[PDB]
Amino acid sequence: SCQLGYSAGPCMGMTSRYFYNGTSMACETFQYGGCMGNGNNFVTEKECLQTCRTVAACNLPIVRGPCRAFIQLWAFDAVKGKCVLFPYGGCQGNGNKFYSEKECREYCGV
């Protein structure tokens, strides 16, 4: 699924949904029609990421993004070689974002 491109489906009940973009290694949004899609369709970026993220995300930059609904999440600091805490803005981030220190450790080593 994570490998599949997004699918809006034939319906017209447009909604914003998340799909994992393996090129950007980021979950992004798309307008889903309400019926007939594929598995690369998530309601939250959390789900999308915990489902589709890979270890290549450990090499990605720590992105706060442009939004201000700040939440403190974990991310891997490649320079220090450790999982650090940062405030994610709520939108347009990438895969190097974990929802627990443990998860960050599990993905990027310890």
Ligand SMILES: *[C@@H]1O[C@H](CO)[C@@H](O)[C@H](O)[C@H]1NC(C)=O
């Ligand atoms: C997936 O991400 C890449 C890199 O950001 C981008 O070029 C491409 O347009 C994205 N795919 C879609 C369907 O937006």
